[PDB]
Amino acid sequence: YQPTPEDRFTFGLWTVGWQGRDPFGDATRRALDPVESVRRLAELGAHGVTFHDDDLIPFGSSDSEREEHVKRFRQALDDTGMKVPMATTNLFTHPVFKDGGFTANDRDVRRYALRKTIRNIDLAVELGAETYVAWGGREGAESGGAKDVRDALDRMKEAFDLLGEYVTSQGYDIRFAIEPKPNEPRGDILLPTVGHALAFIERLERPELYGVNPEVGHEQMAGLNFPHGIAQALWAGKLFHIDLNGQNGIKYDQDLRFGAGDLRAAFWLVDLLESAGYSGPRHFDFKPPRTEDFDGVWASAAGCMRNYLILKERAAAFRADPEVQEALRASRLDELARPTAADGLQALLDDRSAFEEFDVDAAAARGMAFERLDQLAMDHLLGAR
Amino acid sequence: YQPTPEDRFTFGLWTVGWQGRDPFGDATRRALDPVESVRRLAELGAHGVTFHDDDLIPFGSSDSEREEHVKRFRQALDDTGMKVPMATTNLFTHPVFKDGGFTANDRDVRRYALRKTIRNIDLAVELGAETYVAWGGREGAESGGAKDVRDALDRMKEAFDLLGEYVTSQGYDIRFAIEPKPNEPRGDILLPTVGHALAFIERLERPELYGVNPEVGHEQMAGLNFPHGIAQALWAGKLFHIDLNGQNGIKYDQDLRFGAGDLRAAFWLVDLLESAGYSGPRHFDFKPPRTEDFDGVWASAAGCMRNYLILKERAAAFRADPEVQEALRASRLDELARPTAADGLQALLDDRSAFEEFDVDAAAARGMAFERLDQLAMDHLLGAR
Amino acid sequence: YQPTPEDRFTFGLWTVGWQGRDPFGDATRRALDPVESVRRLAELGAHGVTFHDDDLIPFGSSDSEREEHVKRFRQALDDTGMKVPMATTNLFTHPVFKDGGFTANDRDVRRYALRKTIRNIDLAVELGAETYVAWGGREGAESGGAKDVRDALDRMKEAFDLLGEYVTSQGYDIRFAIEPKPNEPRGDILLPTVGHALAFIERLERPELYGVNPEVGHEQMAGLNFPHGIAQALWAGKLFHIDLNGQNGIKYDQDLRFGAGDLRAAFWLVDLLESAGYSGPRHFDFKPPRTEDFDGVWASAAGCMRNYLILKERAAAFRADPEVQEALRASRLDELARPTAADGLQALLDDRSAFEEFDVDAAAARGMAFERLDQLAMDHLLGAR
Amino acid sequence: YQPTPEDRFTFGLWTVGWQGRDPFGDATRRALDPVESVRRLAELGAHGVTFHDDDLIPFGSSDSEREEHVKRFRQALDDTGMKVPMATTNLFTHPVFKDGGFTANDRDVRRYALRKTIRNIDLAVELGAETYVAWGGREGAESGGAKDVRDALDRMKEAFDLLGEYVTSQGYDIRFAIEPKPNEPRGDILLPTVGHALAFIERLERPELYGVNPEVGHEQMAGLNFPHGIAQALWAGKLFHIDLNGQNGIKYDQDLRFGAGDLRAAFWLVDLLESAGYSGPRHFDFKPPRTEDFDGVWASAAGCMRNYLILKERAAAFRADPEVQEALRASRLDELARPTAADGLQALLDDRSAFEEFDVDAAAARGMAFERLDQLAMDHLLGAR
Ligand SMILES: [Mg+2]
Ligand SMILES: [Mg+2]
Ligand SMILES: [Mg+2]
Ligand SMILES: [Mg+2]
Ligand SMILES: [Mg+2]
Ligand SMILES: [Mg+2]
Ligand SMILES: [Mg+2]
Ligand SMILES: [Mg+2]
């Protein structure tokens, strides 16, 4: 189970670079030179890396230092062949963003947030990024009076609309992906789930420029079924990017390596991604636990990719099994894919077999055979067939 | 704090009529004649009632018994002046719906679900219903292989599209409201939150015919902020109906009387509903606990309305307080309502005060004063000012 | 992976016998004759069955019908060789228990609950039960004023103390096991977790007669780590019985088949049960989903046992792997098992290497190597080594 | 509603002193001199302050600087009259504690944790602390193989037993209080709830020296009823100290000011504390949100005390209302307080009115009248009577 760049595995600089600074504790690891991360990730078989503006260029850098950091970074890309498919803006670390970026109550902060974003979009295009992610981590509230949510959604739409005006006026080939999260670091965050972000996008001036970047652990922090949410995003045509990691239920955002947390949900996610032909990056937004030293960092990152590849093989074996294919017919998955009333409304109204002569007791007595199917899926996952 | 029909308080027949049958226990109350509920609710000051088809007409009734039940019901409406603003279909109780109604794997069940719905839409229009609610309680899955969610969303869209074809071909003035719920009775339910339903509606043939019917306890079963979700629905123009009740966090659907559960969320909900001028029914979907006899049923129903009216007075006092209005300015709620860049993109790019000469340290040091505002809201809620 | 009675797999009559009646729906399966369940479970390789008094003897049966039901049941045991290791009382279904059994506010109900329990203890001893389980499903509250919890704990202690007086005065060799649950069907239930029950037992007159019967899904309804809780119960010497099933996070009590829900928690549970030498029944308290017919019932029950046996093999392979054993030493699990200060308090105070000359920076820089260990456990679970 | 030192309100130095450093953001406030906090808290009417060793004496201070910091602190106590009722050890911030303090896998860290604790116990006694709190924030695991929980409980017992040997050998009049928390910063923390800590204490050599320090938000992070848990702790005689704050359901540990979060739970908590005559400190472990400047810090701290005092008045008015007292009799709270069978086991067995002649249908038809009682409590809380 060895990854190749063909597998399109990508990592954020801030992931393997996380120093272990948590709400109750100081850092446990020194900082990583972004050049060193690129080289170690290329050795592990990764396809590319992603970045926040502030990961690459330390905040408040002069134009000249800015240029040094980019040229060093670009040289590591050329030496390794690594790509940069995605980039994003840090609108959450600096104290100025304590009430948000695009939806801060203070107008001058909102204008500053836009300028900081536009500057990094230029840089992301230069480095070849296809997707630009927006995580509004500080957009939200701890108390109800602090934020009028209708006004804040007006400001949020205004920000995204101007960003789309900029990329089209510049003739850039880049698309935006909104990343939802229900809470943390704010008490409640705006657009808290995949569904709220999809709904919001349909009100933008240019909906076709925006999609979602869902993260495994984020939807699970609301107790939701992550493969169900990904299916709705694919159904809407909006799965532009995806963040893979692990999460053990409803609690703080753990960012465990992918495959940890809910293992069966990971199995059904890979099954969905592979059968639907998702072709974007398989990005890992995770944190090697602060118990680890640098050898444990690279072991954890390696494990993300290995676990995806094992699950890919198990899901492919599950769908190819003739015994599973007959189980799928036994549970009538084939009939789910068939139109309910392609004969049309009027034919439906006149069809006595649909109501007057429908035998409800006969239909009700039919078992769905879902438990035998699910045990076949379990046996496959576990390699017990 | 006495309700009048002017307050537009409505109750489902299945609410005060719930016999106490729960997963682990038999009924504790006899059944209520729907005529008797209408009269007792009219005495308490309610504006109207709602119904499932199977609440009013017991399942499998002949055409003749059907007509008797409707005429008895209509007579109670005329005697009391009570209205019927909303109606809905039971697609969850009969065993035939064990894998869903509109998204059952079996095609013939899906056709039967549509015919059962269309029959009740005719009856709801006859009784003057403005809104027709759809709660897909059985649309979902306990296991991942059992339901292809993309296919099921195709079937769900097909069902709602045909329903909209029917109402427009009949020239009916009625609109649909989808009611989301994350889980129970299925392990995960499709369209699990307000956001997922709003997103789904934008893919229907005739989006303008569909809105949402959110329920307090349902969004709280996912840990979400219910007033935030209602604000997004109002922002989208889709709050057609609302279900009020109480819920104590993430657990089974409690359906406590309104005001129980999360009291401060109820305060902020009423504040939002009243300041935005929501003018639809204030519907209570609740269950008097099975510890209660019939006197406790009517006490619980009375309490729903009383608690709304107390919170309405407290929220109105909060917004009218000049001290609160200056606190709102101190926290810059006025600046949130102001466009970020009405001067436009190009003016923003050239505005040096927005980036090159923005003093981030000065902006960052400004306190938001959110805690003083929130304590003013607490004092108001508690009547301690 | 075929079960034998040697594996000590047991099932409740109410499990495979559940008709599918849930809060929102009627039954989907006919009732099962307890004789028929015993025979079908013996065919699947189960070791035995358990019962509530009301599962075996329908409520309100005359003495004569009572005797018929027992003799029929006993004959099925003798024909099959099946055992009855555990029994329990239904103090939750009849409306009389709507405010609880042992802690009902009405004194006469509490006395009735005790008499109903004592009658079934006699029957359980006759049938050879070793353990008598108490699940206080109705002991709790929906509102805060309804129950003084100190008084209710007094009543709860009084009930359990009298039950222990009865078994010792009768010279019975049977022990009690309290089954915790955080909520449902009450809004909050008393003794909501394994920890609260262990604490409560230490206040009984005869603590040695009482232990816990924890259930997988119940502790997970509070977001807790079920293997951690089982370890604390083993540590205290109180794991008398255990209920195995599956649960997908914090929501209504799903009672999925064992191995469904949180798969990695099931792996770590079996690892703990097997390495600690738990020798009691492996009882399954689960519900075949109501989507299923009777063939799906037996497939689901079969799956409970299969999944335990697959996980037993994987956990045994994990602990026997020399590479894992060196990984365990690398993470210092061996040092965790060693006393911190067997040299004693005074030696500790004088040990300069423990404080004055302790190199905190050297200790802090040591990686725990926990991620490599956990990936070895994942590879083992998945059969990828 | 003005606090006096008589009200016994206390604050941690780390509370009003929190700089706003969260997992995703830098500090938003400068550090507070502990002398300045003591003076500002004395002005607000607080009774006293608490501290971690590392709050008062910066880590790694020489003996001489140590003495300066204590003398400065003591002078502020003498100038203000403020007390120090409680103290605790920081065994979570320094990287050396990344796998725990008392249960770290590395033996030498465990010995260091004990020495660091013993040093601060000496200082707490000098300053007059009555209670010494232990929060094992790093005792736990992110993965299942990393910690054998039985071994870790052995080490945990060994640590607490040696601490009790030290205080008794020194003739100190101080008691220990264990503070539970379910998770964060570890994935699961040992002794995760009030119940698990009470159970654990009964296995210590000297149980009478140990009690619990429960925190509002911590039990709510597991979805538990905090007033129920406090009642069990009072029932066991182990409520030595309590931490008051606010929490909005199951998510990261918010540490909102007291009265925020679940308002009705706060009402029932104060009702319980006041009616049971809890006489220890009313300690606030909270965090002024990082949106706030220093004026907002003191407003938030003031609000903690105000909200306790408003709720104290409302709960006292509720219990003194004759209409409530008759409602309590109507719901049979008086009968809950009465022994179930003071006549004894044999009298119970022979009492035909308890079983043979018990009218279950008559008892079952009695309403509990719990909803009318709860609405009286709501009206009282809201000042609507
Ligand atoms: Mg995350
Ligand atoms: Mg992410
Ligand atoms: Mg509900
Ligand atoms: Mg509803
Ligand atoms: Mg259960
Ligand atoms: Mg059970
Ligand atoms: Mg806390
Ligand atoms: Mg605390």
Q: Would you report the number of β strands of chain A? A: 10
Largest interface: A-B, 108 and 108 residues
Q: Are any ligands bound, and if so which? A: magnesium ion
CATH fold category name of chain A: TIM Barrel
Give the neighbour order of strands across the main sheet of chain A: 8-6-4-3-2-1-10-9
The major pleated sheet of chain A works out as:
8 strands, parallel
Strand and helix order of chain A: EHHEHHEHEEHEEHEHHEHEHHHHHH
CATH superfamily of chain A: Divalent-metal-dependent TIM barrel enzymes
**How many individual domains of chain A?**
1
Instruction: Tell me the helix content of chain A.
Output: 40-55%
What quaternary form is this?
homotetramer
> Which CATH architecture of chain A would you pick?
Alpha-Beta Barrel
Number of distinct helices of chain A: 16
Tertiary shape of chain A: globular
Class by alpha and beta content of chain A: alpha/beta
InterPro entries (chains A, B, C, D): Xyl_isomerase-like_sf, Xyl_isomerase-like_TIM-brl, XylA_actinobac, Xylose_isomerase
Organism (chains A, B, C, D): Streptomyces rubiginosus
GO cellular component, one term (chains A, B, C, D): cytoplasm
Cofactor (chains A, B, C, D): Mg(2+)
